[PDB]
Structure formats: C-alpha cells, structure tokens
Design a protein around this ligand. Structure first.
Ligand SMILES: [Zn+2]
Ligand SMILES: [Zn+2]
Lengths: 392, 49, 289, 97, 286, 196, 65, 57, 103, 69
RNA sequence: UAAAUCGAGAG
DNA sequence: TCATACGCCTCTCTGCTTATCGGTAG
DNA sequence: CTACCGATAAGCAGATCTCTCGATTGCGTATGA
C-alpha cells in the first residue's frame, strides 16, 4: 500500500540522551513500519464484546463523521537493535470514504444497499465529516517523471539564476509524493540546481550533484552531455564554461567522497540529523532525498544519466534547437487523484507525530528526568504525553 | 507596521486599517451606506402599466 | 490617455502630411532615409575564431549583398565602414572589458593598400587590444579584425556578446524614431506615419513634409513641444478616435470637459492619486484612496 | 575486492586476432547462438544492419590485455533487431459508409 | 490558461465549464476518460526494447536530439535512431493492442515525438505510472480497442468517424464522436444544432435544476434538499440517458410548448405557464 | 429556417469551390507557385517554419480568414434573401432580423446558410506542436475545414471538429465578456471621483 | 584528450588546467599527476557562427523563401 | 429552463380560457416567445419540439 | 562456424579512446549463476585503479558476439563476449577523503 | 413519483390508467402507441402523461421506517 | 445579533 | 497518573524615493 | 583638487458592482487536579 510505502520511506528519526555512549549516551531510533486503517465500528458504550458495525446511514442520521480507527506500530529501537519495543498505538478515527475497501459497502449488491438504507445505486467517492458530505477535488498538476523545456520570465525576474530558460521535472516517489527539480540557466554559461526541501528554496551548482551522484570523470560528463557532437561549438563552449567554473569555484573537491562530504555539511541543520550521521552519510541522505526521487535510492547511475539528459535538453533549448513545453497544455499534464493527496497528508502527519514524540524526549533531556530509553514505563509515559489525533 | 510573527492566525487590524481599503470605513460606510425603507426582488414584465 | 497620463506610451507616432507635389517616388526614398537601421540589420553572420597559439579573436562580419542592401536601407559601404570603426568596436571592447572585470570577481588581407594599412594602424592605436582591421573597400561584404587578448583570463563566449553589440549598434538613426511607413491615405490626405516621437528632426525636412500639420499620437511630447492647448486638442482627438473606431458616438462636450480638466494646471495631469493631491478638499482624496 | 561467488576464471580460450576483420553482432537473447537484411533464424524475423574497449587473453591465458597492432577498433558493428508484422488494414471493411 | 486547447480532445469536455469567473479553470472530464490509479507492470518492457534494436543506455555514447532517447517513466533505457524509434513505437503499439505479449499492458502509453525543425524535443517516451489520463480509441489494425493519453495523442492521427478514414494517414478512430463530451453534455438533446454559449449554459444549468436528489431522503439529515414531486423521463433523450441509469432521478417534465407571441408578457426571456396546468401539479416541488 | 431545393443547390455549389481556397492561400503566403500539391515537401517545410514563428502564422491566418470570409459572403449573398422556402413577411426569422425586433442578418445567415470562420482573437484556431489542429487532421493540413472555417449550419447541424472549434470560439467570447465588465469599472470610478 | 579548447587526461579523464596559466613547458593532471608536455597540442581553435534567429532583418526574409 | 439554456422567470399564470387553444383542443402549458430564438440560435429546441411531438404521437 | 559460449573475451567501456600502456593487465570474475552471469573486471597499476561492472538490468536481455571474417571465405569464428561498464580511479586519489564531522 | 391523476394540458383523468398500461405492456405484446390508443388517450398531451411516467414511488417505498428490514 | 476565512451560486 | 489557562505560534501595471557614478565652476 | 549637481540603477509602495447560501474557527505546554 501507499501508506506502507510512505512509512517505509520516511525512515527512522534518531535522538540522543546525555548519559556518559561515544556521542551522547544511548540512542533512540523511533520509526513506523505498519499503518493500518480498520472499518468503522461502534463500542456501544462500554459493552464492547463483539464490536458493532457502523454504517453511513447511521453517520448521516447522527450528524457525525464516518471514520475508522487508525493503527500505527512504533519501532522503538534503542542502540540500533539492542532492544526493540514494538507497540501498536491508535491515532484517533481517520475519516474513511464510502464504497472504498475500508468501508462497509465495498461489495454490497444494490438489494443489500437498499436494505441498509443507503440507495438503490449508491456511489462512494466522498467523505462524511460532521454529518456533512465532503469531496477531495481532483487537481491538475505537472506530468511526473518528464523534464520539460520551460521558458518563463519569472525565472530571471526575481530568480537567483540569470536566464529565462530552464528544465523543470516533477519527480514522484513510489509512495506518491512529489519533489520538483528546476534546472535553471545562467547567462555566464553555467547551470544551477534548484529545489525546495522545506518551505524555503535552495540552489546548488549542477556539476556538484553530477559528480556527487556517482564516481565520474570530467570526460564522462563531456561524453554524456555531448554525444558525437564534437563539432557543435555552442555545446562545447558551454560545457567548457561549466567545467572551468566548477574547477575554479571548488578546487578542493577532486573526489566523490569529499564532494559528498561538502554537500553533507552544507545541508546538515535543515536536513535534521543527529550528532551521529557523518558528513558523507548525510550527503548521501540529502542526495537520495532530493535529486531525482522518482528513480529512488540505489539509482545513482540512472540519476546521473538523467541529469546528463536534462543538461543536454536545457542546452538544446537555449540554442533554439527545441520549442518550449507549454505548462498549461493537457499534453504535459496529469491529475492529482484525491486519495493520493490523502496519502501524502497521512505521511506528513506521521512525520509530524514522530517529530513530536522526539521533541518531547528532547524536552525531557533538557529538563532532568530518569530518561531511560529501555524502560517500557518511560516509553509509554512519553507516548502518552504527545498528541496523537492524526484522525482529528 | 507590526513586527513579530512566527506562525500566527490573523494580524489584528490597526485603526488605520479600519479606514483605508475598499472594505475600510470610508468607502464602505460614508461613500455608500445600507438604507432603510428599500426593497429588492426579481423583475417580471408587465405591458399593462 | 486618461487614467495614467503615460508620457512613455507603448506606441507613439506622428502624422506627417506630405506636400501635394511629392509623388510616391521620393516619398518611399524619404521613408527609407528617415527610418532607423541597426548594424544587425545588414550583417549576414559573424564567424568568431578563437586561438591560443595570446587569446586571439578573429571576427569575420559577413554582410548582405551591396546591390540589394544599399537599395533596401539606402546605406552605403562608406557609411557601414564608418559606423563599424566608430561605434561597433568601441562598444565591443567596453563589453569585453566589463566581462573580464566581472570574471575576476575574402583572404586578400595580405594584399593590402597603403590607405587601408594606415586606417588599420589608426584604428589599432585608437582602440585597446585590436591587432588587425580590414574592410571590403571594393564590395562592402566583410570586415575582419583580430582581437588578441591576455591569456590570464578565462574562456569567453564572444558570440552572445557580439550578437548583443550588433543588435544594439546604430548604423543611422534619429532619436526616438524607429520606422516610417507610408500608409494608404484615408481621404485625400497624403499621410506619413512613424514609430516614435521627435518633432525637431522632421522640422528640418520641410521640403518633403509639411511641418504645420504634424500631429502626434503622444500627448506628453505634444505638450512639451507645442503647448498646453495643443495637448488638449490631441487629448480630445485621441480619446475620440478610439470611440469612432468602435462605432460609438460620444458628444465632444464630454471629451472637451475631460481634456480641460486634465490640463487645468498647464500640465498633462491624470485621474489618479498622483494627479489628485492638488485639491482644496481633503476628504475627497481620503475617500478616494 | 572479490564479490561473493565471483570466482576468477581459471583459464580462458585463446582469441586469435593476428593472421582479420573484427565485428560485433548484438544478437538478441532469444536468438539461438548455436544454430546459425531478411535473414531467417528460429521462427521469427529480424533486422540486421571509439565506443567500447576490447580485451584479449594474454600469453598466460589467465588475464585480460588490450589488443593492439604495432590501437585496434572493430571494423564493423551489427545489431540484430527483432521485427514484427504490421499488416495494412482492409479499407473495404474499415471505411463503413 | 483558460483557452480551450485542442490537446484536450476527448479528455476535457469542450462544453462543460462554468461560465463566469471560474470559466476555463474548473473544467470537467470527458465521460469516457479513465484515470489510471495503479502502476502498470513495466518490468519486462526494457527486456523487450533491447530485443527490438535499442542499444543499452549503460554503454551507448549517445546524446542530443539527433538520437531517439527511449525512456520508461523517467528512466533512460537506451538510445536508438529516429526512424528506428518510430518503428519501435509502432511495433510496441501493435504488440500492446494485440493480446499475445505478456509484458506489455494495454494501459501503457507509448508517447513518441519524431524529429522536426525547432519543434518539441524528440525521443520515445513510455509511461505506466499513476495519475495518468487515458482514453479508449479503436486501433485500426486488428479493429481492437486501444488506450491513448494526452502526451501520445498530439502526434497521432485519429479519425473522428469511420467514414473519414484516409489512406496511410489515420491509424486510429474514435469509437463514437460522442465520447469526447462529458455527462450533462451528452444528455443535451441535439447539441450540435445550438450555439456553444448555449450548450455550456445548459451544462451549467442542469446542475441547478430542482430534480430528485435521491430516494432515501427519510434516512438523511441534509441541511437543504430540493425535490421534484413528479418527474418524467424525456421523450427525446440521448442513448446515454439510460446507460447511466438517469431515469431513477428524473430532472423535469415534458410540457406542451408553444413558440408563439400571444400573451405579450414575455419578450426578453420571460415565459408564460398555463394556470390550469399549474393547478394540476405541473412543476410542483417541496 | 428552411431553404428551397435551388437555394440548397446554390449553397452547395458555392461551398464546393472552397475546397482549394485553403491550399491556394497557404501557397500564396509561402510564396510558392500556384497549383502546387498540398503535400509538397517544400510547402510542408514552409508551413513548418510559419507554425514555429508567431508572425508568419498570423499573416497566414489573416489571409486564409479573408479568403474564407469572401466565400461565406458569396454564399450568404446568393442564398439568404432569395433562397428561403418562406419569404418576408411570411418568414418570421427574416422579419425579426430585418425589422430589428431581435437578431440580425449574421444570425440568420449562421442559422440558414453558413456558420463562417471561427476567429478566436482575430486569428484562426490554435495549432498543436506537431502542426495538427486536431487529432482528426493531418499535420500541416492546408484545408479551410481544418482551420476553424466550419461549413455547417445550425439548421443542419455541425460536424464534431466544427463543434470543437465553435466551442473554442464561444469560450473565448465568454472569457472576454467576463473580463471587459471588470476592466471598465476602475476607469469609470477614477473619472467620476475626480469629476464629481 | 583534445577536442576543442578543452584538454582531457588520457588516463583518468579530468579537465587539464589551461596551459596558458601554468609554470611552463609541461602541465600535469590534477588526479593522476601524469606528465603532459606542452607540445603535441598548440592550436586550440574553435569556429563559431551566430544562429539564424539572431539578427532579424528585413533582408533576411527576402534573401530566402 | 429547457435543455438548451433558455432561461426565464414565469411571468403570469395565464388562465386556460385565455390560453390559445388548438384545433385538437390542446392548450399549451408553456408559452415561449419566438424572439428568443434568432439571437441565441438554439435550433436544437426547434428540432426537439417536433421530435418530441412525433414521439408522443 | 563454431560458437564459444565459454568465457574467452570481454569488451569494456571506459570512455572515448581510452588508452593504457601495454603492460597494463586486467582480471576477470564470474559468479556461480546458471544463465546470463554477472561479470566483474578488476585491475590495478602504479597509481591508478581500474574497475568495471555489468548492469544486470540490460546484460540478461541481449547478447554480444565478436567474430572474424575471411576476405575470400564466409567462415566466421563466433565468440561471445560480455559488455562491462567501467570507471577509472587514481590509486592516490582513491583513498582521498576528509574529516568525518565538522564541528 | 406516483402517476398524476389528471393530464396537465387539458384535464383528462389519466390516474386510473397506469396499471392498465403496464398490464397491456406486460401480458399482451402491445407497443406503447397501441396500448395508449387502446386506453383511450388520443391527444399527445394525454399520451405523454402515461408514456413518460417514471413511477419513483415503488423505489421510494423500499425504505420503510415502521417495519423491520 | 457578532466577526473573519474558504467554498457554491444569481444578475 | 494527565486538562484548561498563558504564551505565543510559487509567472502585473504605475509612479515615488534613495543611493551612487559621471560632470562643471571656485 | 573637490563640493554641488545631476543621471541612472535599484528598490519600495500602491493599485489592479450588487445580492443569496453554506461551511469553518490552533498548537503546545505546564503545572495544580
Ligand atoms: Zn588524470
Ligand atoms: Zn390531455
């Protein structure tokens, strides 16, 4: 499922406590490996026993929402598998939608639908919240996994890059979450990578990432961006400008390991990392998290090849060798389904929940508590001190 | 002119903001006012008036 | 026109009435003489050759055929050579040295005449780092000039700057004039229209153009060069001809009142807060915005 | 650095190169190499018509060396491309009035 | 942004849009436009491509628009000539339409951009991911149904009716011309006889009619409901009126209309309704 | 709204002459010699450059629009007044158009004889990046039918491509109608505030 | 190794520094530190021409078409 | 409204006697002015009226 | 006329016109798989490390065959050789690194 | 919903003919026109009332709040 | 009885 | 153990206005 | 020589008809229970 893929690709968030333990005491590695939503049920007070079955007719009549329980099991990992503490934590009632697999009318025939007071030909596709019907509207977004030659005055206007050219690609992770990369252009003969990890934007020289993705030589970059086009003086001049600019600005980075280290300690605070991840490790982390996500991790060679293709496309665009791709043409468009948006929001809420429990642990660290990460009592105490109403 | 906002919800309008824009006091309460003794409805034709 | 008092309107033109005794010939020639021609309008292409055998730059300025360009644009090879040697290199060296400052942060040239050699030496002395110069003094088809540069600087484009310099170089142009087309007369009015406003230039050409009936689309220039009343007249005419083109009739009392209110201080005012503050009553402006 | 299971090949067959044209045939995996343009092989039709570096066994026949004369590049390159049948439509039954 | 582009042929309804401020922005999908919601099996496609003449991308030494860069959902698979890429595109479409190759799903979009002069960047593009836009058309060879998308459609000739198929021009044909229209636009009777600003007005207005919302109104607590007491099925209606089972929710009534200037109480848009008909329950609702 | 048999004969005979109008207009625009085939490689290349540029496309669209407007003017002049089954004053459509009660001669012509050429903003219908105006049409199609010039009428109905083109034109009309009302308001407000 | 103004290392494949900015008579690769004498490559000649869409002129339309 | 975007508020409840009866005795339950058609060119309504009459017959 | 499925030769891909001294030599590997085996080519020199791999995403779909051809006879000696994508690292630069964490 | 008692245009009682029309359609193989003619509906104003009726009342009656489902 | 934001509409 | 008060928690136009690089007289 | 005076280059601030419905309203935290 998309939810399972999302929690798998979230990764583990790590915190430390001060208890002299090379870095800081013991290590905590909180993660989620299974998110399960159940069909709505009613406790009928405190009777419990076999839980009752709630129906959309009941939800509409009660003027409340039609939601099912959301279950997450936390991988409370101490010292990298020294002591694991699994625990299934409910996260409130997640509003489920009608006629879906997590609804009680999933395969009901029209006769049964009439029997259960729904409709002769009831169709789902909507949520019931506070007794009021609601719908997640489908939205048109850029086509995934396609680099489009885009010409826009808003690039040069108020852009850190000085040109109106570029090659924008909106890559999507297998868990249906998007990360766009803009291959800007500079009038002096170089290309700057652009992305937005948080709400702010960042810019990085393209050849930086080109060398950081895989161990490469400058001749490999020349071959990839120029295939048998040696006589193309325009392409050769632009490539020479780019390589000379890289060598002039960063003469220390003669190797992939040290360029990755530079990337890692440049992106350390924003890409929240415990004082355990090395510069090389956090550089590989930001690389796998930002550039060309649709190829996923362990796809560095494919990312390198596609970056070379993107650079060649940008140079062909600025050379007038290809027309710009119209953003608003339906040929270059897709539609955000509406349930994929639900999955993205669920993944982000899970991320915020994990960060919240780690913030609670850090607050305990700042104050003075017993702070024993191996204690089930302390783990349940810190789990009950953090808001868990993801369904709300 | 207020300084200091991390997340917030809505920045409370000052006395200046109560008199400035199209929704301000001037253009909404003296250049045009809601009126007593006035009606409104749909029009239907009548060639006999 | 009315709500912004644009002194920099998108499309400024004048109306030049030709004399009744001037035919289409000597009129199209006058249009070609008055129209603006750029250096890029005549260059076929440029072949930049870079060599480090120190950083030389040989530029071969291919030109359009003389028998056609001297007839289309009425520009001679002598004028071409003059404008090149006077402005093209002067702008090119400036752009090149600016680029260097920012960074740090056909074959008969050997068979040459004495006059050509003297011209080349003179231009070399005049300019900064030019090592050679020649012109097609018999055909006006090419102009080569070496541009040897210091070897300590990095690689330069030398093509996208030559493009900009050629496009921004002026072969023969009168200020604030771009083109002068000859449209079909509306009703017995021999009319010459341009693509810019500069009255003093056409004041000298009394022989072809009747300087008395020079009416311009722009209002600010008319106010500046003719007075407030001419500005009011042209305001009324411009605000009327848009309505007339849309087959809508507005009585001239309304337009006359609008123009008189717009020029009530002797200046090209407008209907906005920047032309509003001159008013006795403050509440009106405060209610405005 | 030997990966798991990647044993070094003990011996290699001799590869003659002197005595002459060197070609590459990019046979698809489906084509049977043992049994051997409108060429017909197996039961399917195919289309047949410095990029890489070539290695050659040395005298010790336990290593790889770059072949050269007195370098050497392949004289011709061929790529066997699998083809299908695209039949013309029957316009009589397609253009229904 | 609001211009009705021709690239939305069969995907976005040309008629269905709300006149006014959201015009052109809040468009609607064609009734036969399927949105893919699962990732098609693209495991075997690279294996098939290499057999078809595609050089592997790992060892190719090729770049630029002079070569046909074959991609699969954003992954550079290989490089091939332009004519060869066109041949592979046609062969892949044939194998996809015919039900013999196991690796090629029918939902796969084969978007091929032939080389041109200052056109779009060429290359063979293959897509199989989620969120795609798909439309069914009849592949002229084998007479079987084919699935196309916006990216692949703008470069392929698709006749609108079988009578206009041209020799060596059209390789696809719409099953019916009426599947490029949305619902509420197919249901407009004789929609090809009106001015378009009236078809779109009817599309916007068919949602505001006081029809029947549902039959389970005794088990609902909706804030406001508009119910037509006695609706009738149209005498004149599209074939899709009963295909979508719309008679379960009648929207109006059949009225004996008279195009006549008699009363004098209706010039601009007004209408005159029989008093006695009204007193007989004509148009009643709650 | 009907025509006579002879009126329909005139209309179809005149419309038969519009087959080559688009090809001739394109050939004239591209400076090619007349009588050239519509599939000439040089003509295709020149139309390719015209499509790539934005001013050559405008010139070609203006020329073809003028030609098809001449054709539709011929059709309307020959058919509308003296080709109708019912004549004025018996023809209520014609009486309403002539007396100014409602509608106009352009409306009557669109209903009865010809719907003319669809102009979006002083220009023909948009073109894809492949030279195709629609999936139904060839790339670089030198045909007035595949240019927005619809030969149908609201009495006999319009074909699917003509329906699409007319929908385009109606959408542009409604967008402009929405925009203009908001456009004029600020101008009027500033004028009246200063001149009150 | 040499294609245009660029000089590549035949061993590793790194851009050699411009010979006009080194000590003289030889330049070495920054990765393999291999000896590359200044001879065997002295004409770093590039030939470039402006695009056809660079100088829009009235005669440009008339010379063709 | 009809199915061709012909809006309009009901103006008056015209009594059946004052309604123009036909030869067969049918008095229409809705009167629409003929002047609405020339400007909007909704010939689909004209086709639909006679098609529905034939269907009902 | 005679095919050689057994490992005899293999073709690499470093870059355009990769040249090494004749004294340079490489070593071949072979995994213990059944069909379409992965190949790893290793080598070293005084100050350079040469290595290569074969992409499994494409090596199991197509075959590469080397052969000879007599000018006057059609006798062709078939030889199967895998294709290896390779990279070159300097030995001194291979171990080049930096500090783990910058405080 | 349920069949209207009187025809809207004229006033002829058609509320006693829906069941007869359904029986004539079901038992005998009569077309809608022949069935309407046999029922005595000559004018198309009366014919449409029974020809185009929907009878949503049967669908409405399946939701009974006073009987166990 | 309020006030703001968003959404859906009419002319 | 655990609830309510305190503390905050990204693609349009016109000017005007300030700062900074050139020039003239004294 | 050097201060008063201009002539851009950049940034800054202010703009871009009425009427009817419906829905909604924050985390975060920290101590007395
Ligand atoms: Zn090296
Ligand atoms: Zn009746």
């Amino acid at each position: 499922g998309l939810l399972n893929l999302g929690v798998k690709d979230i990764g583990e968030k790590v915190i430390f406590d001060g208890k002299p333990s090379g870095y800081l005491g013991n290590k905590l590695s909180v993660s989620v490996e299974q998110v399960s939503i159940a069909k709505p049920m009613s406790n009928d007070g405190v009777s419990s026993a076999v839980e009752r079955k709630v129906y959309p007719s009941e939800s509409r009549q009660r003027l409340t929402s039609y939601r099912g329980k959301l279950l997450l099991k936390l991988k409370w990992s101490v010292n990298n598998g020294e002591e694991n503490l699994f625990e299934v934590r409910d996260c409130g009632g997640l509003p489920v939608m009608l006629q879906s697999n997590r609804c009680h009318l999933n395969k009901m025939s029209p006769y049964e639908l009439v029997q259960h007071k729904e409709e002769s030909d009831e169709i789902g596709g909507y949520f019931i919240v506070n007794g009021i019907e609601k719908l997640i509207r489908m939205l048109i977004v850029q086509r995934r996994n396609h680099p489009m030659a885009i010409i826009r005055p808003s690039f040069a206007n108020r852009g850190a890059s000085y040109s109106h050219y570029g090659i924008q690609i909106r890559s999507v992770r297998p868990d249906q979450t998007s990360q766009t990369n803009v291959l800007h252009y500079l009038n002096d003969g170089q290309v700057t990578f652009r992305f937005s990890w948080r709400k702010n934007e960042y810019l990085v020289p393209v050849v930086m990432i080109l060398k950081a993705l895989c161990h490469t030589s400058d001749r490999e970059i020349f071959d990839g961006i120029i295939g048998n086009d040696v006589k193309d003086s325009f392409l050769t001049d632009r490539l020479e400008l780019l390589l000379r600019g890289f060598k002039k600005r960063y003469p220390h980075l003669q190797n992939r390991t040290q360029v990755l280290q530079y990337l890692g300690d440049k992106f350390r605070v924003v890409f929240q990392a415990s004082p355990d991840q090395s510069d090389l490790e956090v550089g590989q982390e930001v690389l796998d998290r930002i550039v060309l996500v649709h190829l996923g991790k362990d796809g560095s060679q494919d990312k390198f090849r596609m970056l070379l293709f993107m650079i060649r496309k940008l140079y062909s665009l600025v050379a007038g060798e290809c027309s710009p791709d119209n953003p608003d043409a339906t040929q270059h468009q897709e539609v955000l389904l509406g349930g994929f948006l639900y999955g993205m929001i669920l993944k982000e809420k899970i991320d915020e929940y994990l960060q919240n429990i780690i913030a609670q642990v850090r607050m305990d660290i700042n104050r003075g508590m017993a702070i024993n990460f191996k204690d089930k009592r302390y783990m349940s105490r810190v789990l009950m001190r953090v808001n868990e109403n993801i369904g709300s | 002119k207020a300084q200091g906002r991390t997340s917030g919800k809505v920045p409370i309008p000052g006395v200046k903001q109560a008199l400035e824009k199209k929704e301000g006091l001037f253009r909404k309460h003296m250049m045009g006012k809601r009126v007593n003794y006035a009606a409104r409805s749909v029009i239907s034709p009548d060639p006999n008036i | 026109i009315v709500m912004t008092a644009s002194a920099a309107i998108k499309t400024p033109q004048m109306t030049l009435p030709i004399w009744n005794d001037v035919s289409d010939e000597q009129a199209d020639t006058f249009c070609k003489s008055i129209s603006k021609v750029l250096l890029s309008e005549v260059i076929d292409k440029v072949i930049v050759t870079e060599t480090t055998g120190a950083r030389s730059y040989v530029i071969h300025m291919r030109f359009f055929d003389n028998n056609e360009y001297s007839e289309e644009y009425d520009v001679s090879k002598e004028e071409l050579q003059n404008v090149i040697s006077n402005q093209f290199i002067h702008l090119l060296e400036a752009a090149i040295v600016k680029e260097i400052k920012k960074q740090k942060r056909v074959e008969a040239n050997n068979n040459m005449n004495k006059v050509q050699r003297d011209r080349q030496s003179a231009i070399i002395s005049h300019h900064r780092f030019i090592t050679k110069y020649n012109f097609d003094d018999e055909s006006g088809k090419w102009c080569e000039f070496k541009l040897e540069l210091a070897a300590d600087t990095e690689k330069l484009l030398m093509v996208n700057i030559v493009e900009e310099i050629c496009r921004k170089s002026i072969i023969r142009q009168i200020p604030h004039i771009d083109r002068c087309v000859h449209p079909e007369p509306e009703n017995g009015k021999r009319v010459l229209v341009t693509e810019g406003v500069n009255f003093q230039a056409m004041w000298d050409q009394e022989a072809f153009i009747d300087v008395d009936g020079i009416t311009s689309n722009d209002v600010a220039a008319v106010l500046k060069t003719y007075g407030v009343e001419a500005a009011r007249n042209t305001i009324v005419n411009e605000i009327n001809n848009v309505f007339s083109r849309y087959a809508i009739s507005v009585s001239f009392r309304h337009l006359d009142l609008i123009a008189d209110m717009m020029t009530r201080q002797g200046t090209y005012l407008a209907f906005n807060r920047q032309g509003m503050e001159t008013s006795t009553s403050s509440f009106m402006k405060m209610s405005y915005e | 650095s030997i990966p798991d299971g990647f044993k070094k090949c003990k011996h290699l067959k001799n590869f003659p190169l002197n005595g002459q044209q060197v070609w590459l045939i990019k046979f698809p995996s489906n084509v049977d190499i043992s049994k051997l343009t409108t060429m017909t092989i197996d039961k399917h039709d195919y289309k047949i018509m410095s990029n890489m570096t070539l290695l050659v066994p040395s005298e010790s026949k336990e290593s790889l060396k770059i072949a050269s004369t007195a370098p050497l590049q392949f004289d011709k390159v061929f790529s066997v491309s699998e083809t299908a049948k695209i039949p013309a439509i029957d316009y009589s039954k397609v253009r229904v009035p | 942004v609001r211009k009705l582009l021709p690239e939305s042929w069969g995907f976005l309804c040309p008629v269905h849009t709300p006149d006014g401020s959201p015009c052109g922005l809040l468009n609607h999908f064609a009734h036969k436009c399927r949105i893919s919601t699962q990732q098609s099996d693209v495991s075997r496609i690279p294996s098939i491509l290499y057999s078809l003449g595609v050089a592997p991308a790992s060892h190719t030494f090729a770049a630029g628009p002079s070569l046909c860069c074959v991609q699969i959902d954003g992954k550079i698979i290989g490089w091939v000539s332009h004519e060869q890429g066109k041949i592979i595109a046609d062969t892949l479409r044939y194998w996809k339409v015919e039900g013999k190759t196991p690796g090629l799903p029918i939902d796969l979009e084969i978007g091929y951009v032939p080389p041109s002069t200052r056109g779009q960047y060429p290359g063979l593009y293959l897509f199989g991911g989620h969120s795609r836009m798909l439309r069914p058309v009849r592949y002229l060879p084998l007479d079987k149904e084919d699935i196309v998308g916006p990216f692949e459609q703008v470069y392929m000739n698709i006749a609108v009716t079988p009578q206009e198929i041209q020799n060596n021009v059209h390789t696809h044909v719409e099953f019916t011309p009426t599947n490029i229209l949305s619902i509420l636009a197919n249901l407009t009777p004789f929609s090809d006889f009106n001015q378009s600003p009236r078809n779109m007005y009817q599309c916007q207005m068919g949602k505001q009619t006081m029809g029947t919302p549902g039959v389970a109104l005794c088990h609902r607590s909706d804030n406001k409901l508009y119910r037509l007491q006695t609706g009738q099925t149209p005498i004149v209606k599209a074939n899709l009126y009963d295909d979508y089972g719309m008679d379960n929710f009648p929207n109006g009534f059949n009225a004996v209309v008279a195009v006549i200037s008699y009363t004098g109480y209706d010039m601009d848009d007004a209408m005159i309704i029989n008093k006695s008909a009204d007193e007989r329950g004509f148009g009643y609702g709650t | 709204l009907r025509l006579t048999a002879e009126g329909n004969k005139w209309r179809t005979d005149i419309l038969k002459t519009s087959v080559d109008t688009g090809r001739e207009a394109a050939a004239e625009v591209t400076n090619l010699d007349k009588d050239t085939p519509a599939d000439d490689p040089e003509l295709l290349k020149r139309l390719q450059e015209i499509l790539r540029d934005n001013n050559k496309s405008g010139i070609l669209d203006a020329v073809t629009s003028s030609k098809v407007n001449a054709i539709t003017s011929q059709v309307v002049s020959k058919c509308v007044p003296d080709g109708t089954m019912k004549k004025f004053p018996c023809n209520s459509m014609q009486a309403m158009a002539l007396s100014g009660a409602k509608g106009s001669n352009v409306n009557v012509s669109q209903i009865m004889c010809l719907l003319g050429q669809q102009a979006l903003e002083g220009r023909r219908v948009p073109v894809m990046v492949s030279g195709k105006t629609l999936p139904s049409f060839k790339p670089y199609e030198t045909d007035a039918m595949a240019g927005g010039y619809v030969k149908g009428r609201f009495y006999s109905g319009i074909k699917p491509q003509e329906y699409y083109f007319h929908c385009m034109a109606g959408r542009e009309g409604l967008i402009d109608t929405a925009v203009k009302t908001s456009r004029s308001g600020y101008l009027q407000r500033c004028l009246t505030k200063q001149l009150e | 190794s040499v294609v245009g103004s660029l000089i590549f290392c035949l061993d590793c494949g790194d851009l050699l520094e411009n010979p006009n900015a080194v000590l003289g008579s030889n330049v070495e690769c920054s990765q393999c530190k291999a000896i590359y004498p200044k001879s065997q490559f002295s004409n770093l000649k590039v030939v470039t021409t402006t695009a056809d869409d660079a100088f829009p002129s009235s005669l440009r339309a008339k010379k063709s078409v | 409204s009809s199915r061709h975007g012909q809006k309009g508020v009901c103006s008056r409840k015209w009594p059946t006697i004052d309604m123009p009866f036909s030869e067969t005795g049918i008095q229409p339950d809705i009167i629409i002015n003929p002047h609405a058609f020339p400007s909007r060119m909704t010939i689909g309504m004209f086709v639909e009226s006679l098609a529905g009459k034939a269907g009902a017959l | 006329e005679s095919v050689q499925d057994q490992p005899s030769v293999a073709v690499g891909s470093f870059f355009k016109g990769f040249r090494a001294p004749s004294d340079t030599t490489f070593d071949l590997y072979k995994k213990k798989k059944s069909e379409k085996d992965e190949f790893v080519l290793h080598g070293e020199n005084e100050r350079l490390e040469y290595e290569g791999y074969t992409d499994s995403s494409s090596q199991a779909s197509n075959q590469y065959v080397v052969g000879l051809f007599n000018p006057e006879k059609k006798s062709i000696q078939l030889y199967k050789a895998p294709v290896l994508v390779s990279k070159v690292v300097s030995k001194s630069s291979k171990n080049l690194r930096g500090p783990k964490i910058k405080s | 919903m349920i069949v209207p008692v009187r025809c809207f245009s004229c006033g002829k009682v058609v509320g006693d003919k829906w069941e007869s029309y359904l029986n004539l359609l079901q038992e005998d193989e009569l077309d809608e026109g022949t069935a309407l003619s046999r029922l005595g509906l000559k004018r198309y104003c009366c014919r449409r009332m029974i020809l185009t009726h929907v009878d949503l009342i049967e669908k409405f009656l399946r939701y009974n709040p006073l009987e166990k489902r």
